[PDB]
From a paper:
Helicase loading at DNA replication origins depends on the Origin Recognition Complex (ORC), Cdc6, and Cdt1 (3–7). Orc1-5 and Cdc6 belong to the AAA+ family of ATPases, while Orc6 shares homology with the transcription factor II B (TFIIB). Here we employed a previously reported Mcm6 mutant, which is missing the C-terminal WHD (amino acids 839 to 1017) and is referred to as McmΔC6 or “mutant Mcm2-7”. Here, we report two cryo-electron microscopy (cryo-EM) structures that capture helicase loader–helicase complexes just prior to DNA insertion.
Another helicase loading intermediate could be resolved, yielding an 8.1-Å resolution 3D map of the “pre-insertion OCCM”. In this intermediate, ORC–Cdc6 has a conformation similar to that in the semi-attached OCCM. Crucially, at this stage of complex formation, the Mcm2–Mcm5 gate is open. However, the width of this gate is smaller than the 2-nm diameter of the DNA, suggesting that the gate needs to be widened when DNA is inserted through the Mcm2–Mcm5 gate. Importantly, the Orc1 WHD establishes close contact with the AAA+ core of Mcm4 (contact site 3). Furthermore, in the pre-insertion OCCM, ORC–Cdc6 positions the DNA adjacent to the Mcm2–Mcm5 DNA entry gate, while also supporting DNA contacts with the AAA+ domain of Mcm2 (contact site 4 in Fig. 3 C and D). The lack of an Mcm2 WHD supports the direct positioning of DNA on the Mcm2 AAA+ domain, as observed in the pre-insertion OCCM.
Author numbering:
A (entry chain 2): 201 to 412, 414 to 431, 450 to 460, 473 to 595, 599 to 706, 756 to 864
B (entry chain 8): 303 to 418, 433 to 449
C (entry chain 6): 103 to 194, 260 to 405, 450 to 463, 511 to 834
Amino acid sequence: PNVSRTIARELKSFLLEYTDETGRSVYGARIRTLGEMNSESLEVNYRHLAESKAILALFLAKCPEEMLKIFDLVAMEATELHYPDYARIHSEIHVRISDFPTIYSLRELRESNLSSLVRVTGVVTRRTGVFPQLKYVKFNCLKCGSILGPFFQDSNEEIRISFCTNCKSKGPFRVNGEKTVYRNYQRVTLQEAPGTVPPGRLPRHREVILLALVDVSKPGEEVEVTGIYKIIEANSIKRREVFSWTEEEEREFRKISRDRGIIDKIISSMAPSIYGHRDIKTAVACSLFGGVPKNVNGKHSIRGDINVLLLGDPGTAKSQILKYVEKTAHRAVFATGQGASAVGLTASVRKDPITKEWTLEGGAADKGVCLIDEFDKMNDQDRTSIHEAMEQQSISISKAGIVTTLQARCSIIAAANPNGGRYNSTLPLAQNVSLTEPILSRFDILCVVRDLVDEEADERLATFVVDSHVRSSPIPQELLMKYIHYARTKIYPKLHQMDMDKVSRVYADLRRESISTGSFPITVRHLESILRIAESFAKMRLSEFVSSYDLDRAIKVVVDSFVDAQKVSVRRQLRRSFAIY
Amino acid sequence: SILRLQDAMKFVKELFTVCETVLSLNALSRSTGVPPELHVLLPQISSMMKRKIVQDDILKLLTIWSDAYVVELNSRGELTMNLPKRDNLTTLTNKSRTLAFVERAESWYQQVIASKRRSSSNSKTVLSSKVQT
Amino acid sequence: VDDVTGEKVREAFEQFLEDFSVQSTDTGEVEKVYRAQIEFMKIYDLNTIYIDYQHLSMRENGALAMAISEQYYRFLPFLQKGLRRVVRKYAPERVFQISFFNLPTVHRIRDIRSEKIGSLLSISGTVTRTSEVRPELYKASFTCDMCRAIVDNVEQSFKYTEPTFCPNPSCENRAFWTLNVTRSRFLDWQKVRIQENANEIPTGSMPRTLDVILRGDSVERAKPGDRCKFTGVEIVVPYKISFLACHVISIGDEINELKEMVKDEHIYDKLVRSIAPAVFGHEAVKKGILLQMLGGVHKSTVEGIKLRGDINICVVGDPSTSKSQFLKYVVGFAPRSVYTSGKASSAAGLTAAVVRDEEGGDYTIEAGALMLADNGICCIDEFDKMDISDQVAIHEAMEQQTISIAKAGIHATLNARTSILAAANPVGGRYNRKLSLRGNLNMTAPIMSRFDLFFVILDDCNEKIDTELASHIVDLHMKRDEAIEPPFSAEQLRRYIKYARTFKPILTKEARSYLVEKYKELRKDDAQGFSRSSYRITVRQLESMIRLSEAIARANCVDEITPSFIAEAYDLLRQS
């Protein structure tokens, strides 16, 4: 149509007149940055041209495929009169339509959203890149040896050609792509995030096409993609990013956190199914609430996560707590063994059978919490990958033509069983578990349960589990899970050097007493752990800084984990820690 | 202490510019009808200004310009809004709506300042129609 | 002859849809609910309506239904045009799906002839395999050979079509236009495999299977490995006789005998000796097999997660026993029973292996014994000669009730509730009383767990019962002896199993107060043990006796359980 000719000259006049701040045309700086650095991506906010002309925004929302035939041409014309001979190196320059107001979900993708612009959130998986895909074909008929060709896009397998022109034969046909179209690949499968899916339903998944934006995306992270819907053809990608906090719920959270010591109420709200004991749930709540990451002049990155390790006889409950926190906590990933969930933590090059090739993928929650069940039953790859992720916070991929070091700042909640069923209390934990000391040193809290013969446990456990079967004060679950996301995304409580030096005095007693009576020592990692546990309790208390008695609970948490992880012969240490108890 | 001159003016008058483009983003389509709901509108304007948008700001936009947005509440509890025209908002009609909104805000600021530069207004929210019985 | 009959049947169908509104207040007179159904889908715009054939069979004394019923494929665009006209006049991107359901006759796969080609049919059976979802063409954009003009071509759901004349008189050729996918219209298409049910197979015949196609939003509803009932049109495929379905559903003196059998007092004693009349002795194994057919409540929670409310039964002992005979009885008597040999199985084989089809090299998912016969007994003979992969798949299927399959890019999880009858043997065959169950069974602790009851059978030379066993064996070897005969047949036992299955009892407070003391009494035996005691006692054995309590409550048909019937379950746990 000729109506595009009055559209073109309108936006050609628009790019030379957009002065939003202090009378400065930002498009001249944008065109000189794309021309000097040889870029092909042009950035246009939707609000700018929408404030200028809403009919262009309506045309972009209705027919973006024909609206994109004007944008690239006027961008190349602006780059050609701004820079001479730019067409010799770059023939086409695309545009990046950002700031889409109506962000859709993956379950709202319907038949009415066809051939239009849509901004969707998700998580990327299945990374296959830089391959020549098809769009046209040719075929060689072997009987007469002839050529015939149609079209083939990006959804079907291939359009079988079985009828020759003059052979009228059903002979064997061969694929000729030696006269054929250009190829560009980015087959990425995107999925819905688990932190915003409704309960009972399953997250959907789609396939996205990336062309002209390859390997700038990180698998296992949240992403925002703006593209057209037909299979989504992405135009813009954003690696920066329904259950969120509001203004009416944020005042009551400070009012709840100010009154009646809510740390124990959060602990009692953690396990509604059973009675339990506070040693598992205290470590669980401080691991899910986490600490703060700090660096000094861009280096010395400390891990802000807390990795807890559960141990005890297999008859007790260890998977129900992680099953409750998988629904409760945000971006919680439950992974298991060889690959129960068909997703893992380790990078891998492997063959794929759906299309029967070799591919590379770095598995997977960068801010979330990963839950590992049956920690002693694994191979060498998933032990070394979690040891690298527990040692430092990055996982490297060095295969299939790609080299990427991705962030691995995830918390680890692992559960295990000893060799033989019984805990065997007259031996230490290093002789009990099959694991060694440096993989045990990454886990700061080692919680362990035992068997209770006495009437007390018989009076409580059997009665609670029969109350759960005969039926067909704490903080509620919704306010608790909203408080987790509200406190983990807004505050960062530091520490002040006024009277904190006293913990360096008590560590000086507590280190020395572990040599003379005990066999296992205490190091600086325990000091880093109790400072993280104290700042996690200050985060849960929602204070400006860590108080003086948060370290008392932190030293109680480290004493009932380290002293309980040893023999019965460290019994004098049960009374030696009674002076600070 | 209203201080609306230092505060509300400029920020509130850009609410209509984002809101007029987001009601032509959904309601205007050649595919499958659909009624403009307030649950998918607040997040898009949240993307526009990057700031938190409370659902009462749209009610203030209704208070300054009443006849564009109908406040009727659906039976499901969600509060829908619509436009009087059925032939949809043209780009020229969108510019005329922006000029009418800025002219209406200038008229409210001009009439309210005779009591004493913006003088005193809190940009009072419009009364939302209550469900019967 | 149907060109003037199609407009009349379109007028009749729209008169049927126009003359019936809703006047259903106070359960008075009846009139159809279609206009409010269209008014409800006005917001969601899916247009995948459901029209009952029983509600359509009353107009024109059924004659309108009989004329539509044979010429359904020849009257289908007139019906969708009448539906389009009534939603265009009653309401202001347009796809439509009209589904018919609830036919009065259920037809098998062996009674399909060529006289019903194009007519509607109800096909019931079991789904064997499932394929991936694929985008079906719908309408394409053809370009000419010289005009380069766009033509919006509408397919007719048969095969790749092609126009005949160019609309612009710049050309009149008939050579090959080229296809175009920009202005094209895609959707979900699926091809599944239906097969003949196990209760209606002829004597000596083979259970002949067939492929059925499905479109609209009837896809992604049919779960693999379940009894299904489809309603559709018989369409031929180049030839082969396939089917097209539009509706999917997950189907699957008598009271004078049942009320007489629930009023006595010695029913359970004949039930434990009538659940396996061919086996001499072993009342405990018969008790666990009888209580392992019916379970308890699985949704006993306040959090929102389903629990394991089933009974797992595992038999061990020396070889050449009668423990496989129970295995041969369950599968010959229980309708929801799948038997496997164990060695002729694998991980994928047990639940869902993948096999290729050459039309496009595309995969289809074959099922198996696992995830079949829900709320029934899956019986695995030779449990210890299996691999590690299928046993951790069994453990993953027992840790959570759902099962997940991740293959070829697609992820699919489904509900599963089966009771495992595991037949195992030792590493040396002979059971020695020297050590524990763990070292003799030779399998790891998590797959040894989640098992409610273990049955150990040891044999020796005890002449008084041995001569009776050998006499019963030689008396059984004759033409239909009365020695085997039970006190009552299976004829009332099947409806008794179903009547006890739909009972759902509720435990009491006195039973719980006696149960906590019984658990303390059972855990007191662990103190100063190592005699008779052979395994550990924790929450799992407490859950096993809790699940056996509602099973004995259902077997005795009591709504509120007393602790005296749970005392027999306590004695059964003490006997093991």
